[PDB]
Amino acid sequence: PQITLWKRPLVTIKIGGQLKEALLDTGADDTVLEEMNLPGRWKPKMIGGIGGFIKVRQYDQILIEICGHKAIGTVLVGPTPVNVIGRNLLTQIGCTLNF
Amino acid sequence: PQITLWKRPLVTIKIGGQLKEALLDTGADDTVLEEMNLPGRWKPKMIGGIGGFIKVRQYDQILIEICGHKAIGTVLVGPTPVNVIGRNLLTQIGCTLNF
Ligand SMILES: CCOP(=O)(COc1ccc(C[C@H](NC(=O)O[C@H]2CO[C@H]3OCC[C@H]32)[C@H](O)CN(CC(CC)CC)S(=O)(=O)c2ccc3c(c2)OCO3)cc1)OCC
Numbered sequence: 180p181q182i183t184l185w186k187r188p189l190v191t192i193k194i195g196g197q198l199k200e201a202l203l204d205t206g207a208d209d210t211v212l213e214e215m216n217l218p219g220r221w222k223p224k225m226i227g228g229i230g231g232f233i234k235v236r237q238y239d240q241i242l243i244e245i246c247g248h249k250a251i252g253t254v255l256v257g258p259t260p261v262n263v264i265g266r267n268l269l270t271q272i273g274c275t276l277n278f
Numbered sequence: 279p280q281i282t283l284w285k286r287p288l289v290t291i292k293i294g295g296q297l298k299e300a301l302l303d304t305g306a307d308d309t310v311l312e313e314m315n316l317p318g319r320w321k322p323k324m325i326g327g328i329g330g331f332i333k334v335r336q337y338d339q340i341l342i343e344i345c346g347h348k349a350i351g352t353v354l355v356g357p358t359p360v361n362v363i364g365r366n367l368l369t370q371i372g373c374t375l376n377f
Pocket residue numbers: 204205206207208209210211226227228229260261263265303304305306307308309310325326327328329330331358359360362364
């Protein structure tokens with residue numbers, strides 16, 4: 180589809196057997212999701228933006244479905260104020276910017 | 279143009295007569311630039327990102343050209359980690375997400 184940017188580009192995602200709302204974020208290198216108790220091993224990471232850095236858990240090879248488009252890659256989990264789908268997954272679903 | 283997301287969607291912008299590089303950031307409501315001198319009145323504002331809140335200077339009705347497309351809108355100036363073009367200006371240049 181085509182998503183205009185009058186409002187936040189929020190979509191439903193499926194991850195870890197759960198549905199959530201997440202931002203299609205071209206400014207996010209990585210995908211960052213609200214706290215959730217995913218199974219498996221993880222690695223500590225810190226990511227920064229406006230206001231500073233937060234601590235997150237890095238999970239690799241996680242399956243996410245975005246608007247019916249399947250993707251698999253790294254997902255960071257932590258106390259982020261919003262779920263953001265980053266470029267690592269946006270490329271996998273064929274997402275472009277157009278003007 | 280159509281812009282893929284394998285790398286950061288960085289583009290050249292023109293503001294206050296000066297050229298800069300900025301990130302097209304669909305996850306940003308607002309446009310936030312690194313510290314710079316801009317002519318005209320401004321008001322102090324606060325904006326929040328993934329790591330907390332920062333203090334910025336708000337400039338209204340500023341001319342800014344983004345990849346050869348003109349916009350006139352609000353530009354926030356402060357200690358952002360990178361120059362970001364937010365949805366307030368992306369809508370003006372007709373930018374959409376497509377997959
Ligand atoms: C419930 C209350 O919410 P809230 O207000 C905050 O909510 C939000 C809403 C959207 C975002 C997304 C963020 N947008 C943003 O900052 O926009 C601000 C300007 O316009 C306003 O619009 C929204 C906030 C304001 C960027 O799109 C992406 N970011 C990097 C970007 C920085 C600008 C470029 C470096 S990033 O998230 O940091 C990040 C993601 C993956 C990574 C990474 C860093 O590093 C590797 O991988 C983040 C928090 O709380 C305040 C305490």
